[PDB]
Amino acid sequence: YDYHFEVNGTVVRHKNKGFGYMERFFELKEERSKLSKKQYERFNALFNFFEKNGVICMAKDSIEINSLAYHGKYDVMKKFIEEQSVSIEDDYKKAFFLACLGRWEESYDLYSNIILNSIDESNGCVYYLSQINRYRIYQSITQAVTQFNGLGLLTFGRHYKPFTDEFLARIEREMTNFNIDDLFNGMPFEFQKKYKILEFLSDNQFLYDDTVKLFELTNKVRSEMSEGSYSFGMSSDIVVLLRLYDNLRFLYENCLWSVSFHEFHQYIRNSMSLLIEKAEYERTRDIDELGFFMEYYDFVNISRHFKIDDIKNLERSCSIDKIRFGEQEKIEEYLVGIAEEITKQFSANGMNVVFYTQFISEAKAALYFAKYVKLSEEGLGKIVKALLFYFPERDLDIGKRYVWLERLTKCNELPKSIISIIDDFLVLQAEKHQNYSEVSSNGLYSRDYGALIKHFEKNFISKRLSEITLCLTQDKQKQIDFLFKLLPLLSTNAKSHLLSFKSVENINDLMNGIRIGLIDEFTPEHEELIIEYLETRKVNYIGIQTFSSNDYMSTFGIWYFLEEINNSKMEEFIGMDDQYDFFVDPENFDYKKFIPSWLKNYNDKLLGKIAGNKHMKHHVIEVLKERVKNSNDKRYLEILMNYFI
Amino acid sequence: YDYHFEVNGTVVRHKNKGFGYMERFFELKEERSKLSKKQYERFNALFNFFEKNGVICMAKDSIEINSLAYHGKYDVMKKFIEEQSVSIEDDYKKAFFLACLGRWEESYDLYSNIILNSINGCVYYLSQINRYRIYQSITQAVTQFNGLGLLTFGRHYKPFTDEFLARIEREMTNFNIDDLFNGMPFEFQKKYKILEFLSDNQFLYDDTVKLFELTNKVRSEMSEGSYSFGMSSDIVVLLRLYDNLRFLYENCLWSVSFHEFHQYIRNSMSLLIEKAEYERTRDIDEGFFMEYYDFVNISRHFKIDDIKNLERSCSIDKIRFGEQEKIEEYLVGIAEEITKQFSANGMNVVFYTQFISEAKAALYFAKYVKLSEEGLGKIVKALLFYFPERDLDIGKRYVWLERLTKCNELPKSIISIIDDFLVLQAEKHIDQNYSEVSSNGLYSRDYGALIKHFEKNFISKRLSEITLCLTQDKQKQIDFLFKLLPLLSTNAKSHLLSFKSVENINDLMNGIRIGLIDEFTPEHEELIIEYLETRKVNYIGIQTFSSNDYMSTFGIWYFLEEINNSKMEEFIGMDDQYDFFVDPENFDYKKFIPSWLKNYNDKLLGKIAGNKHMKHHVIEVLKERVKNSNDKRYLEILMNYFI
Amino acid sequence: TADVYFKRKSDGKLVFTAEAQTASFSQAILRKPLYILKSEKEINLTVKNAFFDLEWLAMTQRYEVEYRTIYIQFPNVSPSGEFEMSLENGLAPEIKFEALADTDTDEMAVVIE
Amino acid sequence: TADVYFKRKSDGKLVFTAEAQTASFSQAISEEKLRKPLYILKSEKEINLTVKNAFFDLEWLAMTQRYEVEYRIYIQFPNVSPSGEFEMSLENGLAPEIKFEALADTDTDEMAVVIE
């Protein structure tokens, strides 16, 4: 504690009272020939060390992390593993890489062997680090086994058993009554007096200092953003970023497995997503009377240590489209590499479960954040092919995978190769349909892929789906009404053949015909079908109340509002749910039941027509002012400036 | 670690692999006759301890803080102090109390004596911690008084004798704080394991980390809009907060009065109000209120800027303010303490530094409570006459008073306090050097305007007497009472106006503010035009922009047709917010600043909306500000008049 | 503070029972004709204190959930298999599941009163 | 990274020097209801300043046993009141940060001056 070290690279004077050593040292660094030869060589060694770790000077006057594990070079680490280790120093990083690829049994055994061979080590630092990493591997294996006996049964369906029972028994055996808090204390006192700064590594909670410092810095940044104050020196946000990069480089360059634990990911996701919020506040800052851009490293950090829900929350909180994206070539290479790994694994016999849990969580975030980066046609082809065919469907279903695809489509308009890939995926889905149901958590089924295809071509005709339609038979219903939703993709002969057996029996077929564009105006048959379904809906309604998200009722109400329905029987069906009485008879809706969330679902034409009613504008304008004044969604406000509904 | 004990008080079986002693104990608690008599005698004490602390029942099946330090009973603690200590535990209670009312010297001495006299063993541990903390307080207080004390107070205080400082430096040297738990008997270390966290120099890091995780979870729920059904993270935050308060304050630890604990409170609290306010803004798809304990927490651990930021973030005046009587007696105690201190014989500086921040925070944030006439009167008397000038300036103390005025309308009794405060201020305005300076920019004329706004017929007897006493010699009193003209009687008005002349610009602003000027006489046009000539002359390779804000007033007057002389266009080009009002068409609104729109009032804003030749640029500004920012006042301007 | 039952959809066997903690229902809006009221609606549910059925555990070595407070039923609930390890040992398992919807049935959740 | 110079208002003596860390400039109206007539353009102008590393003049310390600030574009606050709030950390302490608020005299009615 004699001197105090800032993350910038400057040293500050607090506590040393005698002669100042670093004061003379830095000035000597800036006539040094007068020292002895041994003094000169050790001064060279120090100079190399201090400029390696970033200690540049004192207070009066970007980062790189050189590690294959951080860059996801998931084949180069394999090549390193196969190569024989000349020294135990190379054997430590091999054990780390073995850990990074699942394969925790081999990592544990190799760490134990390094521990065995570290008797003659000069300092014992590698021994202590190997012990820490072996404990980290041990708890990792324990939690993974607990999950596989727990969540590993719901997920995956089956029981996996990646680690053998004897291996589990022995590792529980030698790890028994092992206190990591004592591990640094249970070391030679030479090691403790020399490697004092590895003591924080010992305890089972080592990031609490960093987490508390980040809490304080985040509170200060929030105070500045609320007050509107302007930081002139080193901003607290810059300090957050500097301590960030220091921590990533420390626990990635020194090959610690603790980097792969939930605590570190939480520290990262809270230290990040605060620089982003500060950047967005800086952009949206009014001028008074008196920028931050993410790099490839930040992209990797968000891709790895951010969950999908957390990225969703941060994009809800702050807009990211106005943050420029640099180092796009490295980001593209990283994304292409991730896609390559998932393809080479799933396409060939699947991939090992232990590495799957580690890989796929960050794969979600990488592919989700891939919307924002600009990618070449070959890269987009590789990553789309990876996401459609060779991605494990148990996580991103059809609806959410479609959202992923349209997200990577936002920045780069769809090239012909991507549309061919989606055509292959749709052909595969068509041949999948057996008593098989296309279920999705998102509600955006396979017809949305064809809708995107037509949106980006308006003339695309899928040959293989056309041939499938030509070979369709009346016995197979699921494929026929699956391709009915894919009607615009088929050719004219295929359309004619499919229309032979396609009939609007229920109103779901009517929705499908509307979405494909087969129906542009209601024939009396369609109106009669709608009225009949409404009759049976009320008949079953009358008797506890039940609300479902079928939403067809609101669609009928909207059709009545837009004058697309011109039969005056709808008023008989009033009262069975809300958002239908809202459109059919807006004056008599009793808007105490009105839900402000409805206006988000409507489009430009619908809310433009609602704006023009003027017998209903004022109630919705009251709802909108209440929401804009209360909530910070900024979508209700955007609606408000657009047309003041 | 055999069982998990959490905040709500429900025991969770966590790592007990043997027989379940907690489940059977709770079954026995909820057939104890079969227990052995000595065993049942122990069981009754276990029941008392486990129900005093929490631990209600199994997982499958309000806070009170009792301490004269937490409640700020600064007179009861004294009375306890001069009483002779019966035992060592009461002596340590008196140690904490002695450390509370300043006087770190006597508390340190008492802690040392308790250390020698201790031969349970936990009292020594707690006293060692508190003695180290008290030495740290004395050391940083010495540093502050040596460095910043001179600039703040204007003089060097040295509350502590140099011999005392030397002795404490010698004694606390070679005392490692982290060691102090390890260097104590194995019996104590085995029994008192839970106190290990208190040994280290940093014992809130675990609590702060848990609070960070909980706050991040709460923010995720806020942004996502998810609904929490079971034990919410918010109630966990507040209940762990209450656990920490009742553990640190009751156990007589000075570690409560540090920046780390204060800042931990400021995070854990004000995250409850943010979530509660967002709960009112919950989007309906297919409450939390503040108690006396909460009032004490915000009054203690929040800086004025912190509560200001809390007000900016959330509308804090809508949350229900319960236990109002306890709150009122709390601020009554604060007011009587500050009056007793600063009324006679200066103040206790070590007490002053610790207590003034709390007093300021409480009196500031008292906007939201309803104080009776007597309590409000004594609070106002403490606020104006007896509160130190250094912390509260005239404008900022006035802001405190007008914020107290929000919940409670001004009574005649409070108006009398404002009246003789103004009389005292007029008395101080005798030497030509003295001029009331305020960081807020508002002055005694604002007190007069407050009085007139709440009565509209008040006549101040003493200021009118001084006005009848005024002569030409004391110009400072003349132009001070000029700002207080509406308070003066008509004879006093004539007597003051006999010597009062509109010599400069500031005099015309004072005359307009008091209401003497209702229409601009041509002499006022001449004066304004001459001042603008002078400004242009001194303007004509560097340019000045001050905060005088007179050119903007002239421009707005030209815009509202108050000034009807067309020589203003000559002065176009020096400073903005002038061309915007004189010739809005050619303003080139790239230089327009949205903050100007904050400074306008209903009449000016309505006229700006009705201009219709500068409406579109300003509507664009309001739109992009409401989209960009979360101020919520720009939206109020945007929708009240659609400007 | 209600109870949730995770059941097998086909067999009907109770996979597990737990206590609900968090539920998010956020439905929001490139994607002249008839207005179809297309929407992108999702439901996520985080549940606490889940102990799996012993019989189902012995058997294992589509799903439907019923969350009963008034009375809610989520058909086609997919359990997300996210797994993250804390360096602190471990305290109860938390299960996250998303509501799935079939194309034909077009319903996501049902509320019973 | 820019510095501030503290002076006594009476003379040119240097009180202390520092480096400005953050400056809070949040000025708006007062309450509208509480404060036909000629417009006055009411205001609640506030400027706060914080300095990170301040060392007081040795001559100032020796003599000690109304202030001006000059923040170097250069800006001047003719009157600054230092908010002497002392809050103490249980971590041993060190960075003496000084916060001061600008003030406006009644006659001058100007708070800060910014000049190139």
Residue numbers in the entry:
A (entry chain C): 336 to 365, 369 to 399, 406 to 634, 644 to 786, 789 to 897, 903 to 1005
B (entry chain D): 336 to 365, 369 to 399, 406 to 463, 467 to 633, 644 to 897, 903 to 1005
C (entry chain H): 8 to 36, 41 to 42, 48 to 77, 170 to 177, 191 to 211, 214 to 236
D (entry chain G): 8 to 42, 48 to 77, 170 to 176, 191 to 211, 214 to 236
Task: List sentences from the manuscript.
The recently identified bacterial Sir2 domain-containing protein, defense-associated sirtuin 2 (DSR2), recognizes the phage tail tube and depletes NAD+ to abort phage propagation, which is counteracted by the phage-encoded DSR anti-defense 1 (DSAD1), but their molecular mechanisms remain unclear. DSR2 contains an N-terminal Sir2 domain that serves as an NADase effector responsible for NAD+ hydrolysis, a C-terminal domain (CTD) that functions as a sensor for detecting invading phages (as discussed later), and a middle domain (MID) that connects the Sir2 effector and the CTD sensor. DSR2 forms a tetramer with its C-terminal sensor domains (CTDs) in two distinct conformations: CTDclosed or CTDopen. Monomeric, rather than oligomeric, tail tube proteins preferentially bind to CTDclosed and activate Sir2 for NAD+ hydrolysis.
To elucidate the structural basis for the NAD+ hydrolysis by the tube-activated DSR2, we incubated the substrate (1 mM NAD+) with DSR2H171A–tube complex, which was obtained by co-expression the catalytically inactive DSR2H171A mutant and tail tube proteins together in the same bacterial cells. We then determined the cryo-EM structure of the DSR2H171A–tube–NAD+ complex at 3.0-Å resolution, in which approximately 60% density was observed, facilitating the accurate tracing of the NAD+ substrates. Further 3D classification analysis resulted in a map containing almost all parts of DSR2 at a resolution of 3.4 Å. In addition to the presence of four distinct densities corresponding to NAD+ within the Sir2 domains, we also observed four densities corresponding to the tail tube protein bound to each CTD of tetrameric DSR2 in a DSR2: tube ratio of 4:4, which is distinct from the 4:2 ratio observed for the DSR2-tube complex, indicating variability in tube binding ratio. We observed large conformational changes in the CTD by superimposing the DSR2–tube complex and the DSR2H171A–tube-NAD+ complex, likely due to their different tube binding ratios. In our determined tube-bound DSR2 structures, we observed that DSR2 interacts with phage tail tube protein in a ratio of either 4:2 in the DSR2–tube complex or 4:4 in the DSR2H171A–tube–NAD+ complex. We speculated that this variation in binding ratio can be attributed to the different purification methods we used. Given that co-expression of wild-type DSR2 with the tail tube proteins was toxic to bacterial cells, we separately expressed wild-type DSR2 and the tube proteins, and then mixed the cell pellets for the subsequent ultrasonication to obtain DSR2–tube complex, while we co-expressed DSR2H171A with the tube protein together in the same bacterial cells. Considering the tendency of the tube proteins to oligomerize once translated, the resulting lower yield of the monomeric tube proteins might have been insufficient to achieve a 4:4 binding ratio with DSR2.
